[PDB]
From a paper:
Here, we report that the nuclear protein BCCIPα, but not the alternatively spliced isoform BCCIPβ, binds FAM46 and inhibits their PAP activity. Unexpectedly, our structures of the FAM46A/BCCIPα and FAM46C/BCCIPα complexes show that, despite sharing most of the sequence and differing only at the C-terminal portion, BCCIPα adopts a unique structure completely different from BCCIPβ.
To confirm the unique structure of BCCIPα and establish the generality of its binding mode with the FAM46 proteins, we sought to solve the structure of BCCIPα in complex with another FAM46 family member. Cryo-EM images showed that a small portion of the FAM46C/BCCIPα-ΔS/Nb.1 complex formed filamentous oligomers resembling strings of Chinese lanterns. The final model of the complex has a 4:4:4 stoichiometry of the three proteins, formed by four units of the 1:1:1 FAM46C/BCCIPα/Nb.1 complex packing together with the D2 symmetry. The N-terminal lobe of FAM46C could also be docked into the map, which forms a binding interface with BCCIPα that is very similar to that in the crystal structure of the FAM46A/BCCIPα complex, as shown by the good superimposition of the FAM46 N-terminal lobes when BCCIPα molecules in the two complexes are aligned. These results provide strong validation for the unique structure of BCCIPα and the binding mode between BCCIPα and the FAM46 proteins as seen in the crystal structure. The C-terminal lobe of FAM46C is not visible in the cryo-EM structure. As in the FAM46A/BCCIPα complex, the binding of BCCIPα to the active site cleft in FAM46C likely pushes the C-lobe away from the N-lobe, making the C-lobe more mobile. In addition, a comparison of the cryo-EM structure with the crystal structures of apo-FAM46C and the FAM46A/BCCIPα complex shows that Nb.1 partially occupies the position of the FAM46C C-terminal lobe.
Author numbering:
A (entry chain A), B (entry chain G): 6 to 125
C (entry chain C), D (entry chain I): 57 to 90, 121 to 205, 214 to 226, 289 to 322
The structure:
Amino acid sequence: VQLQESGGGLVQAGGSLRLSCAASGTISPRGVMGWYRQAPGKEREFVAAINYGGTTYYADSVKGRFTISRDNAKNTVYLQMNSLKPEDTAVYYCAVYYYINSQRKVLLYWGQGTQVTVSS
Amino acid sequence: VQLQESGGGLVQAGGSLRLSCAASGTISPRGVMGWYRQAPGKEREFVAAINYGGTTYYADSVKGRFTISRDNAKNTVYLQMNSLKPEDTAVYYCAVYYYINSQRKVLLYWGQGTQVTVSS
Amino acid sequence: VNIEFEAYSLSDNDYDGIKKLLQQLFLKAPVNTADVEVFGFISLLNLTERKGTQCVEQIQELVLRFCEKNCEKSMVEQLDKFLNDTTKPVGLLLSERFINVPPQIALPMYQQLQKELAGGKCYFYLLISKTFQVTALVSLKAGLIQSRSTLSDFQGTFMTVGIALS
Amino acid sequence: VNIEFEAYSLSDNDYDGIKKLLQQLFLKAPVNTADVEVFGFISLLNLTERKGTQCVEQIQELVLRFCEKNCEKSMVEQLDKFLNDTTKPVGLLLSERFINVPPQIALPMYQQLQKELAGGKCYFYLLISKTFQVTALVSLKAGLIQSRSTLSDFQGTFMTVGIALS
């Protein structure tokens, strides 16, 4: 399963982008799709995730600004990013993972990522 | 070549002992005989040494109190210890060594040592 | 960095299994020579190293997994992997440089760990204990601490030391 | 702990011999991929370890021996033992985990060593250099320093890094 990110680019602060991540194959109904970002010289951090049933999770840094959504028929996850800040500048990666239990997450697939640049 | 220490014992502070170290074989004329001491929980430190020609060396801690001498016919080194202090309490070891050059000392033989105890 | 775990909730055969687990560990290394039960090991670690911090991830993960709700019979199996898996940092650190000291060595090291725990060198300990005949109490203590010297300079980094007191 | 040695008194063939000495060192390890001359290595060390301080005894002894009066032709032979003796800490540390980085990696590390030396991580460096055709100057610098990161986290303890700049 390949994950293909798109919709990255350059935008001004306060602007908006819509990232998309398409999977080349069918994601299991146990599969959660998540977005992660990596700023230059930083670790990869969580941004947002959505399960097959539409339950959404967000990092506190993006809460109220970003909106994750999923199209199960297209095997595609979207991240609507509004009110972009200079600190949202990063490579954004999608990933597919599932929970074995409440403590154990298995990351299965990573995409190659897409660059987002927010200019002042 | 075995080195056999003797003349250790218990003495009061201000008293005197005479250590002797006999070698079971002939020490080369290049051989320096030295005394070293090891207090409980300390490293082994230099006390005094004498070459075959009678040139003497002393640690600053024992200078003016101790006197090393050597009998070449008996293959024996003596350490006269006068004005003993509680800090002179240690196991005293003799050793035979020579200099290859001004920087390189080769220790050849160590004795088993003799206990000196200086009571207050 | 501190990580301290104690369990007083073990069954007599949970204790009895872990004791066997530790015993193979003893037989599997070099052996050295020159009331209550206590068995386990005390391993010195260096946290500026990859090995040092790779261990801690395992140790911390084991302890996290011991904080599961019904996680008690599993203790004996989970310890089996933990310390006998050489494909893993902790099971690998216990195959290399594990030394078995006689009890006259071991008791001082226990007692000082017991002092230091009660009230800079990263130590890793796993320690079971029985107080009797009958069994009055069984205890598995196991932790990661930074303290004063327990080893008598007789121990090096990633050197592990066996405890076996009867 | 600081130990810093510089010699500007080398002959063209003393430089030329040591360069060959370093080159075998390069060929003898894993090779990596993903005017003036400078050749040598920069090895990270941990001084809380036995290896770390066992090295320093050798390094300090080599430097002491380089402070002999007529001790100049001997440089090339004494270095031959130093770094090619695996029966010895420094010759052993350079057989294990020696990595050869391409020049785009190497130059930043040289330059930062050159800054840090001019004005906590124990680094061990040995570095020859020629400035020309003719030869204008030849220099063997070699030392033990504690400083700011030169490695880019791309280096571990007792990992050594090759310098080769032309």
